[PDB]
Structures are given as C-alpha cells and as structure tokens.
Amino acid sequence: GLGTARLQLVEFSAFVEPQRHLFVHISQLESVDVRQIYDKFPEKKGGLRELYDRGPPHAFFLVKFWADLNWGGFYGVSSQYESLEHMTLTCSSKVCSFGKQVVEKVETERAQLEDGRFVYRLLRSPMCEYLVNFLHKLRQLPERYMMNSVLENFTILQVVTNRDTQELLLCTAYVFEVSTSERGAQHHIYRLVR
To answer: CA-CA distances (angstroms) from residue 73 to 12, 44, 107, 113, 135?
Structure first.
C-alpha cells in the first residue's frame, strides 16, 4: 500500500459535483527508478532529486492514474491519512507542466482521534482554478490518445511532512493517462527506488 509505518494514505479522490463523478480514486509493490522521472518535476530545489537525497527512501512512491474524464459544479479533492502517533501534517501539492511548477498548494491538518488511531481528513478541498480549467479543455478533446498526448507533460508532486519536526513523511509523484467510461478510473502504485 501507499504509506510508511508513520503515515498511511487511506483514501484519495478528485471529483466534481453537479452524485459525484470521480476523476481518480484510491481507496485502501513493483519498483520504479526515481531517476527516470526526475525530469517530470523541477530539477533544482524541492525537485525530486533533492528530496530523495534527504530521504528517507522508503517514503517515496509513484502513482499512475487512468482518469475518468466522462461526466459549473463543485470541483474538489479529498484526502485521508492515518497514523498511530499524534502529529500535525503539512501537505504540499505541486502541479507541474513540462516539468515546471505551475501551481503549489499548501495545506495543514491536525490529527483527530478516532477508533484508536489518528486520522487526517482533508476533505472537499476546492480544486485549483488551473486544474478546473485544464479539465474543461481536456475533456473536449475528440480522441483519448490525444488526451494521453497532452497528459504526457502533466504531473503532480505531493509532499507530506511532519510540520513540527520538518521530517518527510510521504512523497508521492503522480502521472496520468485517460481511461474509458466503460472501464472506469484505475491506478497503479509503485515504489520509487534508486
């Protein structure tokens, strides 16, 4: 699964409300050389290389999404994390185009005790205007292969840190293709090694 002993991703979804439609969804391992995707993110500071250098290596994951782009509504992102230790999470999400940052969103969420464990709920976070706009354009493409061509240069990098200790808890890279309405959204989680 996606997580470490200190922090685990439990659920992740991006959606639009008029019942919801899920572009992508993760509800809850093969390897990928991290060097092979350095160019899909900023190569200098806070680039994947530098983060992997500081470590820890076991906190690094790659997720490939096959998004479902078949649906003025509310565009939102929901995330839920869990842990056994009480912490405050700093969640950084960097949207990248052609390997360059076009959006950085930073949120904070404190632990909530529930069922004998700590939960971190970042629900219904409004999707950034750039993504909403991008989705609106993307879905107008006449062919799925054209969507995949455009999505080739679109990546997201999520960094979750312990706000107090500044320790890296979880770093996840996202890459994207499109899936048919018939098949529905899907994902493949990888471990990033070096």
So the answer is: 19, 37, 23, 32, 12
Euclidean distance between the first and the last CA atom of the chain, given in angstroms as a whole number: 19
Q: What's the length of the chain?
A: 194
Which ranges in 103-184 belong to alpha helices (H)?
Answer: 129-138, 144-151
Cα angle, residue 107 at apex, residues 102 and 112 outer, rounded to 5°: 155
| Longest Cα separation, the chain | 49
Of 58, 84, 62, residue with least CA distance to 4: 58
List the resolution, Å: 2.0
| β-sheet bridge partners, residue 74 | 17
The domain ranges of the chain are 1-194
Residue 188 half-sphere exposure toward CB, CA atoms < 13 A:
10
Which amino acid would we find at residue 189?
A: I
Which of the listed CATH numbers 2.70.50.80, 2.40.30.10, 1.10.3210.10, 2.60.40.1120 matches domain 1-194?
A: 2.70.50.80
Q: What are phi and psi of 69, to 5 degrees?
A: -105, 40
The alpha carbon torsion through 130, 135, 140, 142 (nearest 10 deg) reads 120
Compute the distance between CA of residue 97 and CA of residue 152 in angstroms, rounded to an integer: 9
